[PDB]
Curated annotation (Swiss-Prot), chains A, B:
Known function: Bifunctional enzyme which catalyzes both the conversion of PGH2 to PGD2, a prostaglandin involved in smooth muscle contraction/relaxation and a potent inhibitor of platelet aggregation, and the conjugation of glutathione with a wide range of aryl halides and organic isothiocyanates. Also exhibits low glutathione-peroxidase activity towards cumene hydroperoxide.
Cofactor(s) needed: glutathione
Family the entry assigns: Belongs to the GST superfamily. Sigma family.
UniProt-listed GO biological process terms: glutathione metabolic process; locomotory behavior; negative regulation of male germ cell proliferation; prostaglandin biosynthetic process; prostaglandin metabolic process; response to nematode; response to selenium ion; signal transduction
Catalytic activity, reaction form: prostaglandin H2 = prostaglandin D2; RX + glutathione = an S-substituted glutathione + a halide anion + H(+); 2-glyceryl-prostaglandin H2 = 2-glyceryl-prostaglandin D2
Record keyword Cytoplasm present: yes
Protein name per the record: Hematopoietic prostaglandin D synthase
Gene name linked to the record: HPGDS
Residue ranges annotated for the GST C-terminal domain, each copy included: 80-198
Amino acid sequence: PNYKLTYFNMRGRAEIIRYIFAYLDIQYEDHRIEQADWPEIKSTLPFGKIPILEVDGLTLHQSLAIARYLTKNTDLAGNTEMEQCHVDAIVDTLDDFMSCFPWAEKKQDVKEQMFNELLTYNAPHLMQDLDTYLGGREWLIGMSVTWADFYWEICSTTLLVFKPDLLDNHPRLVTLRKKVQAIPAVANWIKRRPQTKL
Amino acid sequence: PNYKLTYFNMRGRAEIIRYIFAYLDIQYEDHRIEQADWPEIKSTLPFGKIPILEVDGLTLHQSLAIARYLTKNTDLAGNTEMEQCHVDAIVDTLDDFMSCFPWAEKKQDVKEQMFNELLTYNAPHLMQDLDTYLGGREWLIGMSVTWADFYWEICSTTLLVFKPDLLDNHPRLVTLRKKVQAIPAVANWIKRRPQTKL
Ligand SMILES: c1ccc(C(OC2CCN(CCCc3nnn[nH]3)CC2)c2ccccc2)cc1
Ligand SMILES: c1ccc(C(OC2CCN(CCCc3nnn[nH]3)CC2)c2ccccc2)cc1
Ligand SMILES: N[C@@H](CCC(=O)N[C@@H](CS)C(=O)NCC(=O)O)C(=O)O
Ligand SMILES: N[C@@H](CCC(=O)N[C@@H](CS)C(=O)NCC(=O)O)C(=O)O
Ligand SMILES: [Mg+2]
């Protein structure tokens, strides 16, 4: 079908969807809006948030709901219902953390303090839990790559911008990142995608 | 299989799982732990959070990941691939808001202030979007109840404790709550479950 992804000109929450389209070799319109155009767009969306994915004109929302929709019946989903649950759980654990950052905090005072606290205190704890969860395994779930591995690489890439030494004590997590980045379709997207901070 | 759900003695994040077990008429061990017994259990979990659901000796985590797992191949999941996406999206939209509340706040005074601001300044926009989304339909997604309807009833039940007039401008959302509460299996669970504040 005809796919149209709408988001800001950032990797952000739309990147997981972009990785899936690239991996599955699916053509889509990568619509990146300008902040000045958001207000009008927002008023037309059922829940006023992006990303959204239009499939033949029908609008879908929530980045992870869309990602799950696109990976169902593909080799990125998980090989059993239980493994699919593990994929979803890891994705939500990562998303829970990313969602904790108060980008909308009214007071720039508290906002700055919270970011530093999450990066210096919480981040290291999560990295340790993920490292232990992965153990000596090749991928986070099963014996093959899943979109949970994609989300790990995506989330860690942005966190590394704020805290470069995040994975100094976890080489196995770095290796996993490199494995995802080395996947042909993914590597090709990473090299051609717009270069943005977030 | 044999199911063992572990959570605190409260509805909270485990309630969606409990509703699903009730609706599907599935037996399970509803393990409710006292605060004092949490520390020693927490240290044994990969990510140190509850609820967790043990299925034939294997542990699953993340409430919504578990809920999705339990509804797969059942009438609660959504009738089409697209509708299953909408179910996931509505659930995440609700969970996104619930996750905004600062339960970790130290000052009880400040904590209540933040809760009241979220319920007064932010909740109204979400309630309006949900009402508009529902329109004059019987259920949020499709023509039959889904676990998204369950989650709406569960989330709104607790929010109403803090903001009694939350739905005074949205009778259609109240009607939906009543419909969920009237389903025999669900009604039975609501009447027999332990009475807790949250
Ligand atoms: C997966 C999930 C979430 C993220 C986060 O980045 C998103 C949401 C925040 N967004 C903020 C830019 C705000 C802004 N205002 N003016 N200029 N820039 C960018 C995209 C996220 C969460 C935690 C730490 C960093 C980034 C990324 C991936
Ligand atoms: C679905 C999603 C999230 C919730 C929230 O309730 C949880 C979060 C924190 N938990 C803290 C209680 C600690 C405590 N111990 N003894 N007394 N108090 C209770 C359950 C939630 C989020 C937003 C508003 C209200 C409730 C419920 C359902
Ligand atoms: N959990 C949702 C988050 C949706 C969200 O908050 N999107 C932000 C951009 S990253 C947005 O639309 N904010 C603009 C606004 O709230 O006005 C997802 O993963 O899609
Ligand atoms: N998004 C996760 C949240 C998990 C979570 O934060 N659980 C809380 C209880 S509601 C917990 O384990 N907190 C106790 C602690 O962190 O020690 C879910 O839905 O399962
Ligand atoms: Mg979430």
